[PDB]
């Protein structure tokens, strides 16, 4: 299975050179073109450039003087570098595969046919801050009848993103993780809740797994199933 | 070179949604289409005008000739709600600005509201956050106000814009930051959620 993984999300200082890597597994670089495509928050898609392993890269005319890409066939990686970043470069950066076929008198890219999950790059001079995670205990007052809700509050982190799983992914049903609020302080908070049947509550443990890659922090907070 | 796509397209449930993408002599080029569901990576739907990769059902089809390319979704479902991008190559890669698909004719749904008091661990850290989680509402717009006892609170409130959940209803959250002393000082706090002209309120009070 050919899978694409971008290097982890985080901060870059204004004016610095952004450096990203895409690691390809489940097959070799050599068969495909490799591109980077980015998406600023609330905006559309912007192609940055592509490369073939034995060819020369080609870049967007708009980014050409600031970007480069290269391929390392022994680590099976593609890199991106982007000079002089500003807040306009804050975006999700996707590593993107394109198939190669012959048509219209050349070998050509035919389709952006496999996209990575993307890595969120936030351009800021501020420092990172990991989350403080607090348990949200279940209430003995169901409002829907027959169910309890318990959760994790993930407080005051920077930058985005944070991901949350429950019981290492073994718990999925009734899980609801809310998008983060941006506070006036410029920090983020979010919440994740699990709804579970009343009759079911306390028959196992509930652990929220909170991942904040920008600070290389992970928290596993156990929520004791006790109402007050 | 530019590709022009409308900002949004809407459809009633189970029926046919048509997306247009225009550009000068677009028919001379090959067009691809991508779908991007909220909070996910784009995914290829159509390549070379009308070909489907294996995971794309036959109810998606593409066409391209003259100055216009189209994407057609038949039997459209709420879970097809997404941004749809067209794309081509003209000396360089060009993406359209994207079209947001809304599936209308959905029944209204009142918000479910869950309000959590500050945890004991947070209070011991000398902080206090009330958490008002709001889910399962349609249409996707609410306003949220807070009260300390019966009085309006302005300071310390942070509220998200609503976002789509997986069952196709919407969710939002709102937070009230207090000092431990403010939390313990009042008889109660309430999160009031207004949806389509009517309001649900939940209340919590210091315990233990």
Neighbouring CB atoms inside 10 A of B131's CB total 25
Radius of gyration of chain A (CA): 22
Tokens of A200: 């079911």
Q: Secondary structure of B9-53 in the HEC alphabet?
A: EEECCCCCEEEEEECCCHHHCCCEEEEECCCCCCEEEEECCCECC
Distance CA A157, CA A92 (A): 18
Which of A5, A6, A189, A194 is the best substitution to test chain B (most B C-beta atoms within 10 A)?
Answer: A189
Domain A1-125 and domain A126-223, same fold? Reply is: yes
SS (H, E, C) chain A: CCEEEECCCEEECCCCCEEEEEEEECCCHHHCEEEEEEECCCCCCEEEEEEECCCCCEECCCCCCCEEEEEECCCCEEEEEECCCCHHHCEEEEEEEEEEEECCCCEEEEEEEEECCCEEEEECCCCCECCEEEEECCCCCCCCCCEEEEEEEEEEEECCCCEEEEHHHCECCCEEECCCEECCCCCEEEEEEEEEEHHHCCCCCCEEEEEEHHHCEEEEEECCCCCC
Number of Cβ within 10 Å of residue B35's Cβ equals: 22
Q: Which CATH architecture has domain A1-125?
A: Sandwich (2.60)
Q: Kindly state whether B135 is in contact with chain A, defined as any CB-CB distance less than 8 angstroms.
A: yes
Residue B85 has its nearest CB partner, among A44, A118, A143, at A44
Contact between residue A18 and residue A89 where contact means Cβ atoms under 8 Å apart: yes
Sequence-distant (6+) residues with CB within 8 A of A55 are: none
Please state how this structure was obtained. Answer: X-ray
CA distance B169 to B106: 9
Q: What is the CA radius of gyration of chain B?
A: 23
User: What is the spatial distance between Cα B42 and Cα B49, in angstroms, rounded to a whole number?
Assistant: 17
Domain limits, chain A: 1-125, 126-223
The rounded distance, in Å, linking the Cα atoms of B131 and B97 is 36
Mind listing the domains of chain B with CATH numbers? 1-105 (2.60.40.10), 106-208 (2.60.40.10)
Distance from CA of A16 to the nearest CA of B (A): 26
Under 8 Å between Cβ of A116 and A5: yes
CB neighbours of A48 closer than 8 A, spacing ≥ 6?
A35, A36, A37, A38, A59, A60, A63, A67, A69, A80, A82
- DSSP helix/strand/coil, B105: coil
Torsion of CA A100, A35, B29, B52, to 10 degrees: 60
Angle at B42 between CA A52 and CA A32, to 5 degrees: 15
CATH 3.40.50.1980 fits A126-223, yes or no: no
Which among A178, A163, A146 is positioned nearest to A208, based on CA atoms?
A: A163
Collect all residues of chain A within an 8 Å Cβ-Cβ radius of residue B53. 111, 113
- B112 to chain A, closest Cα gap in Å: 8
| CA of A61 vs chain B CAs: smallest distance (Å) | 8
Q: What residues have CB less than 8 Å from B18, skipping those under 6 apart?
A: B9, B70, B71, B72
Q: Provide the CA B188 distance to its chain's centre, in angstroms.
A: 32
Nearest to A112 among B44, B98, B207 (CB): B44
Calpha distance A189→A171 (Å, rounded): 22
Pairing of strands B112-116, B128-137: antiparallel
Q: How far apart are alpha carbons A6 and A18 in whole angstroms?
A: 13
**Cα–Cα distance for residue pair B42/B36, rounded to 1 Å:** 4
Count of CA atoms in the C-beta half-sphere (13 A) of B164: 16
């Amino acid at each position: 299975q050919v899978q694409l993984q971008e290097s982890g999300p985080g901060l870059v200082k204004p004016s610095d050179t952004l450096s990203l890597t895409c690691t390809v597994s489940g097959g070799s670089l050599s068969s495909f073109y490799w591109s980077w495509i980015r998406q600023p928050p609330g905006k559309g898609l912007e192609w940055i450039g592509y490369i073939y392993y034995s060819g020369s890269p080609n870049y967007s005319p708009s980014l050409e003087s600031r970007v480069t890409m290269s391929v390392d066939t022994t680590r099976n990686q593609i890199s991106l570098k982007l000079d002089s970043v500003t807040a306009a470069d804050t975006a999700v950066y996707y590593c993107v595969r394109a198939s190669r076929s012959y048509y219209w008198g050349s070998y050509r890219p035919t389709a952006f046919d496999s996209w990575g999950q993307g890595t969120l790059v936030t351009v800021s001079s501020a420092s990172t801050k990991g989350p403080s995670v607090f348990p949200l205990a279940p209430s003995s007052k169901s409002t829907s009848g027959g169910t309890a809700a318990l959760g994790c509050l993930v407080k005051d982190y920077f930058p985005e993103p944070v991901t949350v799983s429950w019981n290492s992914g073994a718990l999925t049903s009734g899980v609801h993780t809310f998008p983060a609020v941006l506070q006036s302080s410029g920090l983020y908070s979010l919440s994740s809740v699990v709804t579970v049947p009343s009759s079911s509550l306390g028959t196992q443990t509930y652990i929220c797994n909170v991942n904040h890659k920008p600070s290389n922090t992970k928290v596993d907070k156990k929520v004791e199933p006790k109402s007050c | 070179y530019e590709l022009t796509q409308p900002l949004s397209v809407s459809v009633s449930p189970g029926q046919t949604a048509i997306f247009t993408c225009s550009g000068d002599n677009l028919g001379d080029k090959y067009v691809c289409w991508f779908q991007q569901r909220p909070g996910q990576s784009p995914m290829l739907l159509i390549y070379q005008d009308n070909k489907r990769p294996s995971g794309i059902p036959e109810r998606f089809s593409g066409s391209n000739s003259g100055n216009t390319a189209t994407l057609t979704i038949s039997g459209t479902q709420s879970t097809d709600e997404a941004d749809y991008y067209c794309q081509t190559w003209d000396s360089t890669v060009v993406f359209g600005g994207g079209t947001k698909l809304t599936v209308l004719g959905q029944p209204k749904a009142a918000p479910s509201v869950t309000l959590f008091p500050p945890s004991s661990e947070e209070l011991q850290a000398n902080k206090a956050t009330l958490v008002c989680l709001i889910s399962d509402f349609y249409p996707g717009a609410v306003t949220v106000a807070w009260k300390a006892d019966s009085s309006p609170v302005k300071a310390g409130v942070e509220t998200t814009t609503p976002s789509k959940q997986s069952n196709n209803k919407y969710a939002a959250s709102s937070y009230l930051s207090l000092t431990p002393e403010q939390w313990k000082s009042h008889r109660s706090y309430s999160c009031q959620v207004t949806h389509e002209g009517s309001t649900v309120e939940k209340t919590v009070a210091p315990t233990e």
